[PDB]
Amino acid sequence: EHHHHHHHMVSTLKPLKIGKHTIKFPIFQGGMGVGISWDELAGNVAKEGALGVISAVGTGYYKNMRFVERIVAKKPFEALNFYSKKALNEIFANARKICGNNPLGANILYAINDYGRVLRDSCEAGANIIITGAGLPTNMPEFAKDFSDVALIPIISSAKALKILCKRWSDRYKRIPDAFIVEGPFRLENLVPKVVEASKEWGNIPIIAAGGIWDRKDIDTMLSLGASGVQMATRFLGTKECDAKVYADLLPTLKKEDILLIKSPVGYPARAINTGVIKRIEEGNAPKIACVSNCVAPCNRGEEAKKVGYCIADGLGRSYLGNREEGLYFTGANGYRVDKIISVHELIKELTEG
Ligand SMILES: Cc1cc2nc3c(=O)[nH]c(=O)nc-3n(C[C@H](O)[C@H](O)[C@H](O)COP(=O)(O)O)c2cc1C
Ligand SMILES: O=C(O)c1cccc(NS(=O)(=O)c2cccnc2Nc2ccc(Cl)cc2Cl)c1
Ligand code: SF4
């Protein structure tokens, strides 16, 4: 008993309009770097009618630095090669060999260096939607002016941030966000109604709930609270089509006690698997830190990486390249609930049937 792409699926979930774009199911696959949500994952998610989201961070690592001009110590040299336009273009092109013209997003952290350049690169590569968190992105329209149809979606954690972003954008660009993703840094079941309420002032911008959403019962709860859709990362992290192939080996064995919150050179906490570089640091076998890729502004070219003990660009790139000893591995809080690695098709069927 296997459901295939030529079979029908009956859903009571309704299509979701984001700006000029429509997705069949009110579900975003959350962007995941480095190299977790590239062409295979994002293309297959979009093929199924959810929003596939390509992570635009660290694209220089794609296919072992296929598209970088300069390499240093096996790393992309500087932001121009770490956020590689040519790699981003090929990732989008390969996604669309799978999903065609179905909508695709690009996720870009606001804290990266060359943020505006990577936003414009994402539009030029074919992104229909830009998603940005890790900051308060008050100038997203500045870099998208040449791409009127690309929808812009900040990630926020409060109704105050919604009101601020809508006012700043409206006053400066005569435009407001096309959607908001709401995530806790405070429980999601109390944040969503507050943000939904605040959006009323600005025209019922769709609100996408994110964080800890696992199954259709969680989706239904979120829609009942006024959310227009959900964003899910960890569930897709555990699919076969994930572009970082180590996770299919790592998640099935992952126990709750091995998930932990850590500091980062970006100045935002991350949730990591207690393995790889995190174990190397505690042994006193930490990899050398010497900023090559210059990934994020808050680090100041290695100042903060040296303080917290690891380089996030180096560690996340090593994981994409298959490095179990020195890679950095992330997970949502529900990562320990992954037992089987299933297909994207199987997952979407589970989340949408009925
Ligand atoms: C492996 C991994 C990589 C991530 N990378 C990004 C990223 O590049 N950009 C971003 O906005 N969020 C990133 N996140 C956060 C997720 O997009 C998402 O907000 C959070 O994990 C979703 O909650 P869930 O995993 O509970 O569904 C990442 C999460 C994981 C697990
Ligand atoms: O909520 C959770 O459980 C959760 C679990 C894991 C990650 C996140 N958020 S995060 O955006 O990924 C993130 C946070 C903190 C520092 N860095 C980050 N990302 C990042 C930075 C630089 C590069 Cl070069 C690449 C990437 Cl991916 C949330
Ligand atoms: S040293 Fe800091 S800015 Fe440089 S690549 Fe590493 S985390 Fe990024």
Numbering used by the authors: -7 to 177, 195 to 363
What does the paper say about this structure?
We later discovered that H. pylori encodes an atypical species‐specific bifunctional dehydrogenase/isomerase enzyme FabX, which introduces a cis‐double bond to the saturated acyl substrate of ACP via a backtracking mechanism that expectedly reverses the conventional fatty acid elongation direction. FabX utilizes a nitronate monooxygenase (NMO) flavoprotein family conserved flavin mononucleotide (FMN) cofactor and an active residue His182 inside the catalytic tunnel to extract electrons/protons from the acyl substrate for dehydrogenation and cis‐double bond formation, storing the captured electrons in FMN and [4Fe‐4S] cluster cofactors, respectively. Subsequently, FabX transfers the stored electrons back to the oxygen molecule located in the oxyanion hole between FMN and His182, generating superoxide (ROS), which is further excreted by H. pylori as a major source of peroxide, likely enabling its pathogenic function of gastric mucosa corrosion. Here, it is demonstrated that FabX is essential for H. pylori growth and gastric colonization by retaining UFA synthesis and producing ROS, respectively, and is a species‐specific anti‐H. pylori drug target.
Notably, compound 8j (annotated as FBX‐1872, hereinafter) exhibited potent FabX inhibition but only low antibacterial activity with a minimum inhibitory concentration (MIC) value higher than 64 µg mL−1. This could be due to the fact that the carboxyl group of 8j readily deprotonates and acquires negative charge at physiological pH, which reduces its lipophilicity and prevents it from permeating the bacterial cell membrane. Given that FBX‐1991 exhibits moderate solubility, we employed its highly similar analog, compound 8j (FBX‐1872), for further evaluation of binding affinity evaluation against FabX. FBX‐1872 exhibits comparable inhibitory activity against FabX as FBX‐1991 (IC 50: 0.437 ± 0.042 × 10−6 m) and increases the stability of FabX by ≈20.8 °C (ΔTm) at a concentration of 50 × 10−6 m. As expected, FBX‐1872 binds to FabX with a K d value of 0.435 ± 0.046 × 10−6 m. In addition, we also determined the crystal structure of FabX in complex with FBX‐1872 in space group P21 at a resolution of 1.60 Å. The structural comparison suggested that the structures of FabX–FBX‐1991 and FabX–FBX‐1872 complexes are highly similar with an RMSD value of 1.919 and both inhibitors adopt exactly the same conformations inside the catalytic tunnel of FabX, indicating similar inhibitory mechanisms of these inhibitors.
